[PDB]
Write a protein that binds this ligand. Sequence first.
Ligand SMILES: O=C(CCCCCCC(=O)Nc1ccccc1)NO
Ligand SMILES: O=C(CCCCCCC(=O)Nc1ccccc1)NO
Ligand SMILES: [K+]
Ligand SMILES: [K+]
Ligand SMILES: [K+]
Ligand SMILES: [K+]
Ligand SMILES: [Zn+2]
Ligand SMILES: [Zn+2]
Lengths: 371, 364
Amino acid sequence: LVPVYIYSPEYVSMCDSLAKIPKRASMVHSLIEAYALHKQMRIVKPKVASMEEMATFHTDAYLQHLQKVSQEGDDDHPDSIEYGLGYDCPATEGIFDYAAAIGGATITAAQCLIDGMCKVAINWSGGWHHAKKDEASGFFYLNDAVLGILRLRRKFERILYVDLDLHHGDGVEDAFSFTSKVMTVSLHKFSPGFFPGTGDVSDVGLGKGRYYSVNVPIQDGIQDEKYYQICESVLKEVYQAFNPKAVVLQLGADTIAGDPMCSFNMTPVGIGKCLKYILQWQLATLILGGGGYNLANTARCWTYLTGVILGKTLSSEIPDHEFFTAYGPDYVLEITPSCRPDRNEPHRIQQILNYIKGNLKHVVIEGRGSH
Amino acid sequence: LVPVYIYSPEYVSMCDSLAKIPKRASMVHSLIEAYALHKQMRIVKPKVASMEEMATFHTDAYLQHLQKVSQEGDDDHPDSIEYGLGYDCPATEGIFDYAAAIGGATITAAQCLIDGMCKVAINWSGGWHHAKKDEASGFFYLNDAVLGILRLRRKFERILYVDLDLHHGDGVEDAFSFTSKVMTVSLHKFSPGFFPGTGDVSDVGLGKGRYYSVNVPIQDGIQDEKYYQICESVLKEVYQAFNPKAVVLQLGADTIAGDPMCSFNMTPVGIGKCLKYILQWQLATLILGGGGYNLANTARCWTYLTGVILGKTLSSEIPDHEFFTAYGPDYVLEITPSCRPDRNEPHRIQQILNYIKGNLKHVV
Ligand SMILES: O=C(CCCCCCC(=O)Nc1ccccc1)NO
Ligand SMILES: O=C(CCCCCCC(=O)Nc1ccccc1)NO
Ligand SMILES: [K+]
Ligand SMILES: [K+]
Ligand SMILES: [K+]
Ligand SMILES: [K+]
Ligand SMILES: [Zn+2]
Ligand SMILES: [Zn+2]
């Protein structure tokens, strides 16, 4: 079918106001439009999440606080720190609207998958995977990934969450840590001192969800080839062991070379092969954005990935558009890896893969109501 | 005889409004106050920099552009992007006031050194070393470090600028890249892709300023002892060859273990050891802050350093105060290094030191 593209001019404008990534939404969309990729997609206007929809994960008390702060702006409300607001997650005007819009956008995309409208639905402004039920975290206030998965859960019994952001998707993993309906897989930088500090290979979920959480700790400097070897290896084992019926894929672009966080050393081509491998499963796939703080590079990456979804090859020259001047000095779509070492010892990587393969041996495929 | 401490309730309050580091000024000050360190210091209220004083480095067109944005906002002004305003340096109300306040505080501190008022003057909310003469850069809109050096030049023949921030102090180095009367030494993370991307060991300044710029490219995971070995080794040769008459020291705390940038693996003790070595010279020293994005750790670091300057030993236990709850889970002054590898191979490090020693044979 034709992939669904969650978009409206109001939605993009709303997302443009996110304090940590100002104007990133417009840069991403305008580049995608400049390559005319929206013409080959089914543009679907996002619905704003209702209170009840957001409440599927978040507590009423926290949501009401976000609502209060959203009006009164950045006063120093006595309870804001308790709800994770502050440095990482600024308590400014309109944050409840931003939450409701992004959350609802991911829910809308999920509903498109359910209603069989498409096999792939895209919400590049989604993918905020840190927020807890009662606490903002990691640059955002709501966990739209969880809300998307919870929506898909209405129809799908086995859901695979794949998180390729530079950071560990702790919020999503924690949300489903005790259940086996949702398997979380996160490839991320894992290093003492690095946010959020969780997600070692030994972290496998708890209770009845034990072994239904997969973590792949990776060090600085990893490039396309080695990343894909790890990803395909893990994903092949996961697919075989878990047999998912629907996929939610987070594609945070803070792994891409040039990102100020300067950790991984990836290009969108590498992420693209991971995406390709997931696509050929031909399952309902919910595509999400996430981190990405080299704004022009993030637009580069997600535009390319959009092209991969459409099975189209894009021209190297960045076409003229609103933000053309931000693509200097070369004004091309390709991204060149930085000249720095890959700190990943192959035998450590292999040991990690071995642990994971062993963990997945414990994974069964049971139907609703088993035994 | 007693160190000058640049402070006023209004100054700290204004610095709290900096977008990239909210509340950090109050956290630093309240912890210093909680240790009663301000009682052993001479509290000097900072004066606001005038357009003339800021003009000693920054162009009038840029300065007037800041004031326009500061009195209005980001009305998508077409020239803002050219003046460095944007992602790193947001164009909001009050940015001119912020710049004038911090610049004027570094100038006030420098003026204290001149008036024989002290041998150490401190401006923790200063140390913003990236901004160009006509362009905002690196989380701030003004180069207060440069403005401080220029003020000291009204008295001292030779100024040594030591930059121990995680990032290359490119704004300062570039401002004095052609001159021999100001020498810049910067220890920083140097790795392709890491801001600002400059400051290799081969970069030594230009023209008459050749060899009067020192850069020490360091990799991730460096801890206290190795760092001080490098810093002492460099500053030993520098002091012996350049013979400074005044020192401007930038102590950005983004090198400290626990910083979200997660690059270096330092504790305030290692930095303090570098600071003691500089204070040993007994020259007029201008203390500056800078980076530091683990806000509690930054307060921890600069409170400790304030104690080093006063020659005092602080209690291990964080005393109760306004931000006490932010000091968990251990509530202690000391910071523990992260269990990360040091990526600095000793051969490359020693080769860098030789290269620097070689360059320092031309300075006389
Ligand atoms: O994309 C992300 C990043 C959100 C978490 C941010 C971690 C905290 C951090 O990096 N803070 C920081 C970095 C640089 C300067 C100041 C603060 N997660 O998926
Ligand atoms: O401390 C400083 C300021 C450094 C400014 C670094 C700008 C690049 C950067 O780190 N950007 C960034 C990081 C995380 C999230 C968003 C942007 N200088 O010494
Ligand atoms: K991840
Ligand atoms: K699970
Ligand atoms: K430095
Ligand atoms: K110089
Ligand atoms: Zn991330
Ligand atoms: Zn810095």
